[PDB]
Amino acid sequence: PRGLELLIAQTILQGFDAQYGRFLEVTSGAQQRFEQADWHAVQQAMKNRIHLYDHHVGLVVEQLRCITNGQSTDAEFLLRVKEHYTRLLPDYPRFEIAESFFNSVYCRLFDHRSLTPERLFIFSSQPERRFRTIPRPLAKDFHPDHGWESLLMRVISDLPLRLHWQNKSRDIHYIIRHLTETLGPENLSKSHLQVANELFYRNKAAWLVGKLITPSGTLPFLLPIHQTDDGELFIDTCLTTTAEASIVFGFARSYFMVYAPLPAALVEWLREILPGKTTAELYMAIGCQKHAKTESYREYLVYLQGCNEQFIEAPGIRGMVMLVFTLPGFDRVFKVIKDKFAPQKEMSAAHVRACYQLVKEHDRVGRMADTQEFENFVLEKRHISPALMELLLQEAAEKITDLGEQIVIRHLYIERRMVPLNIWLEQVEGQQLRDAIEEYGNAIRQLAAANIFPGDMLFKNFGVTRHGRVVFYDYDEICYMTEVNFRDIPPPRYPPWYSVSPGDVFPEEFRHWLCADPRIGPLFEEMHADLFRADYWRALQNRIREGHVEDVYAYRRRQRFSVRYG
Numbered sequence: 001p002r003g004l005e006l007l008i009a010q011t012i013l014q015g016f017d018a019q020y021g022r023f024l025e026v027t028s029g030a031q032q033r034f035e036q037a038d039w040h041a042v043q044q045a046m047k048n049r050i051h052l053y054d055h056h057v058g059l060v061v062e063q064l065r066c067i068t069n070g071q072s073t074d075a076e077f078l079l080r081v082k083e084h085y086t087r088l089l090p091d092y093p094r095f096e097i098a099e100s101f102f103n104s105v106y107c108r109l110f111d112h113r114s115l116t117p118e119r120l121f122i123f124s125s126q127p128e129r130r131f132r133t134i135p136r137p138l139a140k141d142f143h144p145d146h147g148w149e150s151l152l153m154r155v156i157s158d159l160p161l162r163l164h165w166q167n168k169s170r171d172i173h174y175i176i177r178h179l180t181e182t183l184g185p186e187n188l189s190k191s192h193l194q195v196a197n198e199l200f201y202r203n204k205a206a207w208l209v210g211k212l213i214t215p216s217g218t219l220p221f222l223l224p225i226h227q228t229d230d231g232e233l234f235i236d237t238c239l240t241t242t243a244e245a246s247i248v249f250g251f252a253r254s255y256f257m258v259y260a261p262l263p264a265a266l267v268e269w270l271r272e273i274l275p276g277k278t279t280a281e282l283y284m285a286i287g288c289q290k291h292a293k294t295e296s297y298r299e300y301l302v303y304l305q306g307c308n309e310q311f312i313e314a315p316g317i318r319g320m321v322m323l324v325f326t327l328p329g330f331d332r333v334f335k336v337i338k339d340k341f342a343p344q345k346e347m348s349a350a351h352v353r354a355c356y357q358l359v360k361e362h363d364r365v366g367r368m369a370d371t372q373e374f375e376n377f378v379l380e381k382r383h384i385s386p387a388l389m390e391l392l393l394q395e396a397a398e399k400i401t402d403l404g405e406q407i408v409i410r411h412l413y414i415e416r417r418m419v420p421l422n423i424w425l426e427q428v429e430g431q432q433l434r435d436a437i438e439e440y441g442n443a444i445r446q447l448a449a450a451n452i453f454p455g456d457m458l459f460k461n462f463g464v465t466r467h468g469r470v471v472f473y474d475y476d477e478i479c480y481m482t483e484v485n486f487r488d489i490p491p492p493r494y495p496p497w498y499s500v501s502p503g504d505v506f507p508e509e510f511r512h513w514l515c516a517d518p519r520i521g522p523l524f525e526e527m528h529a530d531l532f533r534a535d536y537w538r539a540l541q542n543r544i545r546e547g548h549v550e551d552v553y554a555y556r557r558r559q560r561f562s563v564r565y566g
């Protein structure tokens with residue numbers, strides 16, 4: 001009886017302990033991967049780290065099964081287990097993530113249905129932290145008592161990175177000028193530094209994240225440590241702006257790889273810098289993706305209970321395969337695969353689902369948005385707008401089940417809500433339009449350089465962020481770059497003896513679409529003409545196959561030290 005309820009509760013908790021343990025054993029390898037520039041490893045780590053959590057929830061559920069099987073499928077029994085599990089939390093440093101794990105297990109057990117607040121931690125059970133004193137620092141303070149050249153030499157001479165610096169003084173002085181031109185000699189000496197103990201690794205970079213304490217108030221202080229074609233460590237640029245920081249930790253970049261024995265602590269410190277990020281967003285930034293899903297559902301529930309607006313179909317051009325809706329004042333959209341696709345389409349829901357999975361664990365490169373897959377998402381009929389309820393019933397009838405006052409959508413994705421780039425290009429003008437086309441062209445370029453070929457490059461498949469960045473979001477259109485045949489001469493039209501086969505792509509036909517509006521055409525020819533040349537694309541897939549891995553700067557290129565300062 002009791003003993004069993006306890007074993008279960010404890011095997012679930014032992015499960016979380018083990019998964020987080022494994023999770024950071026992986027993370028700790030980031031330094032070595034970067035130190036030996038093993039770029040291909042860095043990416044496999046991103047995939048293995050992402051699967052860990054589900055792997056363990058898997059093991060734990062199997063155990064839970066053998067351990068009983070008869071009771072696992074029993075809601076009365078699990079009510080007790082939750083009871084005990086909850087009494088094990090007051091101790092655990094990572095209790096919040098411990099709750100998510102319990103939920104994950106609960107869900108696998110009941111195939112994601114009947115999720116009441118009494119059966120799982122949809123809410124928390126624990127009092128809000130509101131931090132005391134971290135058991136151990138997590139960040140060090142640096143005062144310029146001879147500082148700036150001394151302060152910096154001291155911090156640069158603290159990184160555990162085992163490679164040679166290709167002229168520190170050089171980089172160290174670049175940093176000084178920036179601060180100087182930014183704070184003014186006076187306050188620069190009134191201001192100090194507080195840099196996090198751990199480096200945030202991502203791709204071919206090792207990030208330093210600290211706080212610039214100005215008498216004006218605290219500010220972001222980030223230094224992207226890069227490495228030369230032959231192992232030289234150098235600091236490329238320095239960002240002390242909140243907006244800048246928001247991009248570096250943007251939702252369209254792969255999560256950072258930062259060693260964090262106590263996540264909640266790290267998250268809270270982070271709020272200071274980039275204060276526009278919500279709780280889930282901060283977790284997601286440092287890698288706790290599954291836990292952020294838990295927090296996302298909470299922020300959703302909060303916003304929902306506090307608004308008298310109904311769910312309506314997302315603004316823009318309706319799609320051939322997905323049905324996407326949103327709440328007026330909410331910063332996300334829901335996307336569901338439609339029962340049947342438009343005649344012009346010949347792919348399976350399975351393939352669509354595969355693409356979303358493909359990009360989730362991909363080097364998102366800052367151009368593809370993170371998404372959250374939800375099984376059996378529940379909505380309250382009285383919340384769905386009449387126009388939308390009929391769309392769902394007509395387009396996704398198979399994916400929705402009635403429950404009287406509420407409906408259940410079986411599968412769906414949730415992602416950052418942006419404004420469809422096709423709408424932006426019709427709202428913006430002048431400089432703002434140039435910035436969009438450049439931003440758009442560079443999106444294609446970077447996706448391409450990371451073995452991702454957008455399927456349909458039409459504006460309607462891209463979105464514009466709060467910062468005016470163009471991010472791709474129509475994932476089932478995608479295919480790997482080393483999997484498409486680029487061609488020079490386009491097939492005749494007379495708007496087929498000229499045989500074209502699956503995989504063929506004619507970069508010159510792009511002119512026709514991407515340049516039909518006289519407003520933007522010229523802008524393309526000026527900033528992105530290369531995109532119409534099949535030679536350009538083939539060169540790109542050559543470096544891919546050659547195993548090359550292009551660099552990505554989470555900032556404007558004209559901010560790189562080697563650009564502005566000589």
Ligand SMILES: Nc1ncnc2c1ncn2[C@@H]1O[C@H](COP(=O)(O)OP(=O)(O)OP(=O)(O)O)[C@@H](O)[C@H]1O
Pocket residue numbers: 314315316317318319320321322323324333415416417418419420456460461463473474475476477
């Ligand atoms: N992240 C988003 N933010 C804002 N609107 C979005 C977002 N994602 C999709 N939409 C809305 O839905 C439309 C895009 O639907 P979408 O392109 O994703 O279906 P689909 O992707 O075309 O099917 P397929 O992938 O096979 O091309 C846009 O018109 C846009 O208004």
Ligand SMILES: Nc1ncnc2c1ncn2[C@@H]1O[C@H](COP(=O)(O)O)[C@@H](O)[C@H]1O
Pocket residue numbers: 057099100101103104105107108112115121122290293294297374375376377378
């Ligand atoms: N259908 C759902 N409705 C509401 N929350 C969910 C749903 N599915 C999963 N979650 C939440 O997301 C976390 C589980 O993610 P997962 O393990 O992939 O099922 C849990 O902490 C749950 O609170």
Ligand SMILES: [Mg+2]
Pocket residue numbers: 319320460461474
């Ligand atoms: Mg589309």
